[PDB]
Amino acid sequence: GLLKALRSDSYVELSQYRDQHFRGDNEEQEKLLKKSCTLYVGNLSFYTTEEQIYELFSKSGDIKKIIMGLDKMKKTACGFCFVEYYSRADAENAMRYINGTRLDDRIIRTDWDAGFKEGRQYGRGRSGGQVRDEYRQDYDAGRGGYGKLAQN
Amino acid sequence: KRTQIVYSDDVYGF
Amino acid sequence: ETEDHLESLICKVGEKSACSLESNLEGLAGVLEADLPNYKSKILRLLCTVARLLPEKLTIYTTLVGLLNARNYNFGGEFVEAMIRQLKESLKANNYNEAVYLVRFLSDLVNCHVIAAPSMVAMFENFVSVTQEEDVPQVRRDWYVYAFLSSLPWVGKELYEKKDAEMDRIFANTESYLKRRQKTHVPMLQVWTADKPHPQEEYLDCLWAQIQKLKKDRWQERHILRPYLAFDSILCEALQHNLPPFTPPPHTEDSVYPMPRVIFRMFDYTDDPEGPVMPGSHSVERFVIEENLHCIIKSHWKERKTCAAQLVSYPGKNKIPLNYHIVEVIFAELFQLPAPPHIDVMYTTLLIELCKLQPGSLPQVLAQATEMLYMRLDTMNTTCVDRFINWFSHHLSNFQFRWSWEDWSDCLSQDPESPKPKFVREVLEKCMRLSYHQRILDIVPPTFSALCPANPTCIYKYGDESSNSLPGHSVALCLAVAFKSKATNDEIFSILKDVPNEGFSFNPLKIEVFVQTLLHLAAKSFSHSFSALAKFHEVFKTLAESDEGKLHVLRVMFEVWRNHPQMIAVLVDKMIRTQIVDCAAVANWIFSSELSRDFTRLFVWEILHSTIRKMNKHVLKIQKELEEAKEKLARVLEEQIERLQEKVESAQSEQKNLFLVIFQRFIMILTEHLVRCETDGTSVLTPWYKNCIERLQQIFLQHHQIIQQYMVTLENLLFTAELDPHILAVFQQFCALQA
Ligand SMILES: CN1CN([C@@H]2O[C@H](COP(=O)(O)OP(=O)(O)OP(=O)(O)O)[C@@H](O)[C@H]2O)c2nc(N)[nH]c(=O)c21
């Protein structure tokens, strides 16, 4: 027998996000997310290396693959990535303890991903980078500068 | 401060 | 959902509230009595659950059961029956750590007039009588003694009033048992070998001393909340219950007992003179505080914000320096040998969340602790130092690498291989891996630039500055051209024919020019380097089919990437997974002369243990395919079980030979050192020896469960009476963990 309060594991719950280009139903997407060993990793610096992500994310377990998030046009790092673990348990621990901590002094944010396919490494915004980077007003040294509307 | 690398098209048992 | 309501009410009693604890308990006891007609079933299950999973709130729930016993005797009786079924069932299933909480619950129920004091003394007579069982492990005897002694801060006064003659007997037998206990395990489990400023005591010696002081003070302690004392009227008119006689489940060969422990200790009252006086090492108050704090972490480890909250809001009868206890308990878990209760990374993040809740006080305590850990480095076990290094570096990366490095200037005049400068070197290296070379150069003073990591750059043997008189220089340049121009496996092989030097298959220069060149052209990133190993995988498998080939791939790969240990680690990992090399090759490579100068560095042992872990998982995986195919038969396929059984045996054999190789190489180099030191009359305990003996220690600690399978082979063939007692001690320590 168990207590609900102790079974609580809120850092491992699904986020609001879904992949809009996902060939499938929503129930079919959630079914994959609940079994995934792959994490989307948000709010990275453009200058953060693959080798830094490996060092940090290795603290929750053994990493199978890191797929850097790239600008569709320029094919340079545009501030996200994917981290695939060999086991679910190691990915859960990343979501519990690496999620919301710092990498190159920025609070990174992790979410369950449905799985890598070709084309998913590329930013889906107009200008080539991430959608989040177009609309934003602020100045962010680590993400190019101003948002892509107010830049040019 | 640092240099970004560029990623190729072709970069992506026991 | 009255079912869900009842759970939430039972869980929420005892937490922070506008009303008193007494009021809430009385109130809830009323609400639960009302629902007994048609929720007795549920309420029993819930209270049995919180007895097992919420020992941190023990006296809240015993009081609650006591109040329910008063209003309904029959309910109390069914509960006490269910608890005894649960206790016997927990012991049967080797949940000895849950069983302690159940034993303490029953104990404190005596103070609530639910259990008759005679029954509890009878049970403890049977517990301590396990010390007179013959031909059983010390760790079995230990647990039954610990379950008894650790219950006494709650029930010790009540039992020693009602039955003082019977308890003096139990105490007599307990004392004479503790006197004849073997302490072989202790040096393997201490975080520090130094007994100043705080000895790291063996857990039963310490508990004994605590219970002795408690007894000397007429069983009076200043910490445990006892809500039941404010219901003295109601609880005295309640009738008591008797426990059945208890027969400890007898020792089988399927029995598995808790390993002994050594109590972590870094603080006393002198470390916090302003704040409330810290209970001393030998007070039960210190035991109870730390036991509850550990239990809180056990309950809420998954929820870092909740966990931090629950720790900060920990209640006691009297004021304590809670921030010091929280920090001490956290490092106690992190540095526990053989391993922490939870994943190491959790502790880093938990301490961050605590700094967030207590930003005015906690960060200063943590920095004070960090200072103390550093200053006591000279005798810290290597396994614990690795963890200290990984915590501190990761912590710094979450606070802009801000640290007053000049406070540790004492390291600069010391021998570079001493614990302090080594510690600083390794921390800065770990910082660099989370940052970049220039950032780490900037965040330290110029006195400390001798300890910074070097720039993680590739070393190509056949580059610009290299003379073209090197063997195979012209072949290297052809490979460079071929690789740049999307060459195929056959074209690379064809180029490698033009190179000098079963029947004879291994060429060291072919490997050397192939590896040097391929690694150089994929040096851009890990992804590029992995892609290169995948694309030319067939060339690797042909060049390194030989065991001396595998060893030479690793020799060359090291000469390329010796400034970038992180790269080495991930390449070795990929080469093992793709079968370019095998575990056995990596083991011999680590103990090779080419790594001699880097042997005491972290990355070497990160690679070894990572390599061992892949091997262990490989065997587990192949063992599950066998189990699954057998259950299919139980319900053509019989000819597939015979192939898998062959694979398990050869996998298990590869695993065993991996450990055997590691132990042979350790025994060799340790013997070499010890013989040299008896010849020269010089000190045995050098920094190199401290590291080497403690790294052997680590193999046993980290993999005790697998190594337990090889006991007969190790006693007979490797760790024999012929060995130097310095080396044999380690194996004897390892044996003590389940002896
Ligand atoms: C914000 N993202 C972005 N992302 C993935 O990273 C790649 C590029 O993301 P993007 O350019 O921000 O696309 P989009 O998803 O529209 O972003 P958003 O909806 O935040 O504006 C895509 O494969 C996208 O699915 C994500 N994947 C998961 N699992 N969770 C997430 O929260 C996110």
Numbering used by the authors:
A (entry chain B): 4 to 155
B (entry chain Z): 361 to 372, 379 to 380
C (entry chain A): 26 to 526, 535 to 668, 687 to 790
Question: Which text from the study accompanies this structure?
Answer:
Here we take a biochemical and structural approach to investigate which binary and ternary complexes CBC can form with three nuclear factors, PHAX, ARS2 (arsenate resistance protein 2), and NELF (negative elongation factor), all of which directly interact with CBC and are involved in CBC-mediated transcript processing.
The best results were obtained with CBC-NELF-E360–380 and m7GTP giving P21 monoclinic crystals that diffracted to 2.8 Å resolution. There are four m7GTP bound CBC complexes in the asymmetric unit with clear electron density for the NELF-E360–380 peptide in one of them (chain E) but weaker in the other copies. Remarkably the NELF-E and ARS2 C-terminal peptides bind to exactly the same site on m7GTP-CBC, at the interface of CBP20 and CBP80 and induce the same slight displacement of interacting regions of CBP20. NELF-E Tyr367 (which partially stacks on NELF-E Ile365) is buried in the same pocket as ARS2 Tyr859 (which partially stacks on ARS2 Val857), with its hydroxyl making an interaction with the side chain of CBP20 Glu53 (middle). Finally, there are highly analogous interactions of the NELF-E C-terminal Phe380 with CBP80 His651 as observed for ARS2 Phe871 (right). This tyrosine makes van der Waals contacts on one side with NELF-E Val371, and on the other side with CBP20 Ile70 and its hydroxyl group hydrogen bonds to the main-chain amino group of CBP20 Met71.
